[PDB]
Amino acid sequence: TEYDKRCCCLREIQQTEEKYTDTLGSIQQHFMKPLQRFLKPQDMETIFVNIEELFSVHTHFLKELKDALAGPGATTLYQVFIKYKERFLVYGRYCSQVESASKHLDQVATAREDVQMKLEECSQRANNGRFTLRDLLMVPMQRVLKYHLLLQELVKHTQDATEKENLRLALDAMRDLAQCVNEVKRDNETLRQITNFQLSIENLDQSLANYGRPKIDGELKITSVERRSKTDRYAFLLDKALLICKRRGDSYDLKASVNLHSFQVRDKKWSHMFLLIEDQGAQGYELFFKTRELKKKWMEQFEMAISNIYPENATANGHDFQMFSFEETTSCKACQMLLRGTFYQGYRCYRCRAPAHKECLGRVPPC
């Protein structure tokens, strides 16, 4: 019965891909084309995002998929998935923008009776009123997250140990893809938070995202060598620095960027404190917090920030790994899976330029 289930599964892979590609086609031909006469280019871009790229990629994917399945033993099927893994990274953009697209579609349709009526017509023409455009826009998110499931099942059914091994490579690829799409969404959300912080800070020396991911922000009292008594400050902790600011109205003026490459943590109201001190430096800070609970929370976040700058195994096996923002699709030198997200995705060895995930540093072959 295992072989029967194997062949059913192969057929489902093809049939569901055909249906999906046709759904993308229907969006393009029954909704996009007609709505161009109703919506400004700006509106079209916001609502449909990169659906046309998805249609182009999947049309070709489907052809290669059908070719693989028609070949003896479907032995090249795993290659098609692996081949398209990086092409499918376009889902990063789609899934990061689909909420905004859906929101904007609802807004235009509520504002404009003629658009609402056209949408009802388009739905009727496309699918007999079964599915709204708003619903259809979620189908791509659904699809990209089916691939790992279909492959997981295929692996289970086939009794061919060679085919199992090859398909496991494709399963790994589609799980990797799904994680990448998830991390792109997370990074875009984080970047929105960073942009909002940046707009409220005055006198920044550089883009705030250069400092990495936000950890914690809030009120504290600080003493310095240059200023001995407790002064009220507002701080933003990111991976690479503590940005000490003074609240001026609704904005924050940057007074000091404390570089965490150098500075290390040494352990009533406002008495709860720890030191931020440089290894051999002339400058040291005392950071005072309102409560013990706030002190604990900040110390924990400082630990996380420093762990990102100086991860376990950063200098293992001759390497010198440092936080790095990759601007092109990149694979980890240890595990061969993709670096995930849109900025500070992992590490790059200063010496040999090997890219690696934080978790993989000790497993990269010697420098």
333 binds, among Zn ion, other proteins, none (CB under 5 to 8 A by kind): none
Looking at residues 161 to 190 of the shown chain, list those that interact with other proteins (rule: CB under 8 A): 178-179, 181-183, 185-186, 189
| 216 is an interface residue for Zn ion by CB under 5 A | no
Contact range with other proteins by CB under 8 A, out of 92-100, 163-171, 275-283, 308-316? 92-100
| 4 is an interface residue for other proteins by CB under 8 A | yes
**Least Cβ distance, residue 164 to other proteins (angstroms):** 17
| 153 is an interface residue for other proteins by CB under 8 A | yes
Of 38, 131, 310, 350, the one binding other proteins (CB under 8 A) is: 131
| 18 is an interface residue for other proteins by CB under 8 A | no
Count of residues that interact with other proteins, criterion CB under 8 A: 35
| 348 is an interface residue for Zn ion by CB under 5 A | no
Whichever of 227 and 351 has its CB closer to Zn ion, that residue is 351
Of 319, 323, 343, 355, the one binding Zn ion (CB under 5 A) is: 319
| 14 is an interface residue for other proteins by CB under 8 A | no
β-pairing, 241-248 with 251-259?
A: antiparallel
Whichever of 1 and 280 has its CB closer to other proteins, that residue is 1
213 binds, among other proteins, Zn ion, none (CB under 5 to 8 A by kind): none
| 316 is an interface residue for other proteins by CB under 8 A | no
| 357 is an interface residue for Zn ion by CB under 5 A | yes
Of 66, 83, 134, 168, the one binding other proteins (CB under 8 A) is: 134
Looking at residues 101 to 120 of the shown chain, list those that interact with other proteins (rule: CB under 8 A): 102
Of 24, 80, 260, 332, the one binding Zn ion (CB under 5 A) is: 332
Helices 90-111, 161-200: inter-axial angle, 10-degree rounding: 60
| 192 is an interface residue for other proteins by CB under 8 A | no
3-state secondary structure the chain: CHHHHHHHHHHHHHHHHHHHHHHHHHHHHHHHHHHCCCCCHHHHHHHHCCHHHHHHHHHHHHHHHHHHHHCHHHCCHHHHHHHHCCHHHHHHHHHHHHHHHHHHHHHHHHHCHHHHHHHHHHHHHHHCCCCCHHHHCCHHHHHHCCHHHHHHHHHHHCCCHHHHHHHHHHHHHHHHHHHHHHHHHHHHHHHHHHHHHHHHEECCCCCHHHHCCEEEEEEEEEECCCCCCCEEEEEEEECCEEEEEEEECCEEEEEEEEECCCEEEECCCCCEEEEEEECCCCCEEEEEECCHHHHHHHHHHHHHHHHHHCCCCCCHHHCCEEEECCCCCCECCCCCCECCCCCCCEEEECCCCCEECHHHHHHCCCC
Residues near other proteins (CB under 8 A) = 1, 4-5, 8-9, 12, 16, 19, 95, 98-99, 102, 130-132, 134-135, 138-139, 141-142, 145-146, 148-150, 153, 178-179, 181-183, 185-186, 189
